Design a protein around this ligand. Sequence first.
Ligand SMILES: N[C@H](Cc1c[nH]c2ccc(O)cc12)C(=O)O
Lengths: 331, 331
Amino acid sequence: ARPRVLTGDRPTGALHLGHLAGSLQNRVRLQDEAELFVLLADVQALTDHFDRPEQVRENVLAVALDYLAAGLDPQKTTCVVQSAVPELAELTVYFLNLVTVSHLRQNPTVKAEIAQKGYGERVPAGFFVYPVSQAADIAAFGATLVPVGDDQLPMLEQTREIVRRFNALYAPVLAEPQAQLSRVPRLPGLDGQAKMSKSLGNAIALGDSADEVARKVMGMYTDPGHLRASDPGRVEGNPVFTFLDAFDPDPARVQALKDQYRAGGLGDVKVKKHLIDVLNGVLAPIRTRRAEYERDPDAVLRFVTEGTARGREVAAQTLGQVRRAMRLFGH
Amino acid sequence: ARPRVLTGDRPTGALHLGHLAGSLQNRVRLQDEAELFVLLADVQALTDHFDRPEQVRENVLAVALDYLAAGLDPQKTTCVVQSAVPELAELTVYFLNLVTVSHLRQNPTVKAEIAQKGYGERVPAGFFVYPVSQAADIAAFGATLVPVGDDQLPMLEQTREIVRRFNALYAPVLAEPQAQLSRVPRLPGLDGQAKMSKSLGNAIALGDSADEVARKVMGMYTDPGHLRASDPGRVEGNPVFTFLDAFDPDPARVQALKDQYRAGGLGDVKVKKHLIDVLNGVLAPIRTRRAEYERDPDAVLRFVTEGTARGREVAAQTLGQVRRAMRLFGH
Ligand SMILES: N[C@H](Cc1c[nH]c2ccc(O)cc12)C(=O)O
């Protein structure tokens, strides 16, 4: 517990195996060698889900349950609800003056999302400027380390420009955050697509039953050219093997499996059955804690209402110095 | 009282004659005909003066003084400093999700302001966005009536739109403001321009001495082509007449000079000379009123502090409604 690390998830659905490999595991590690803060960004979730406020509301508790199921320690990690800390909002609006529409339009990651969203020009304002609300999140909690995939680096980098701009314009009161680069490639979807998502229908939820997990794995895309066991099959592009690199404890088995697959005679059945055993080893403990916490709804609530209290006070402090630094009337 | 009315100014310096005929005297009277709220657009002032925060701070107290001297009674008008009401920023954020960047792009007023400031695509985000920030101002204070210069109609119309869309998506807890058109269009500058502003240097502040006000009138643009008294002059384009037209109480008297001046026996001096006093007359009391308060500064601060408290009170009530209407987690 030395540098303050900030991370988060916009509450839009249940977390899945892609988040586990992509961020959860790394976060379970950080809670022990840093002060970890996780933001359930329901406000940000609203920049595009403003038409589904029920969906966002319901998932704040569900993801929380997921963080816990994943192994995030209530006594270690500060879980906070973005909605319950208006200080952030207050900061984003001040941050908006420190950034140009031109530079906000150039963010490649948001540009890409607007692209995949098919918005066109009809981009909802809140979404267009979310990178700054994120910057507000970072500075307000006074985080100095932020786990980031190269896809969020422009978000982080903008944050750096903002704090830099704020300190120089007013007073050097905000900490410049630093990135904690990558988590190695992103987990692909069951049918082999680049992205794993509930939406795409190709995900395995952390809460999926061991039976379900078995089934989903059984129907996984493999190698179009591999038609029968005897045949030789390709590993590259074959998610069954990508999953194995991200969760199989012993690469010796993995590498061995890979061999015999390119050779021939190693059908997808024998490989998949082995993924199932590795996934169940990774997921089982997570299933148990999830079910446990289901019996103790109050415990999940305590997890967030208290993280929030803490988060609220921290952000409250920062705005304090921000208000003073900006020379706001009465400060 | 009866309806809630919201009016305000961007604290960037002393108020001038334009504000007077622009609204000041208007609210003076609507001050007992309704619940009048006057917002010192502290924050909106930064989307333009984000590099000169000192300038703003200093002028909050200076404009408030201006307000009192202009006739506003502490017992009937709630003066509110925007920055001390963080609830407004909160609501601004939520509102951003209700409009598209392409819609903000076609606001005729902001576009004109933008072109004047030579920002180009390099428009600060906060500025490009101030229209909704104001809509938030309106909705948070529950204002049902909002005086508006011809020029601020687009903004007014945007507020209703956003309020409308908010009520449908979430719940009908916000009131659509209705406009109060004025007669006297944007008082022109001494320059002969369309705008009077300290920025353009063509203004007669409410604090200027009898000597100055007179000096300002004498250098007031009039009519080229009209070189010597004798000659026939024309009222179109002449600031002095459009000045009398807004500060002179005897219209028969006005339409009089309008005759002679088209003939040729009414020296611009004579016109000016008159008008100068018609201004000293409308300004006489204001001057005496300012001295009093200038000697009881404690009172000005009181006006601001008590009002701001009351106002936050109101904002807090609306946000709570808003927060539950949006089904934000926990409400
Ligand atoms: N009057 C403004 C600043 C402003 C912001 N919100 C409102 C609401 C109602 C007003 O009457 C004015 C304001 C200006 O002229 O920019």
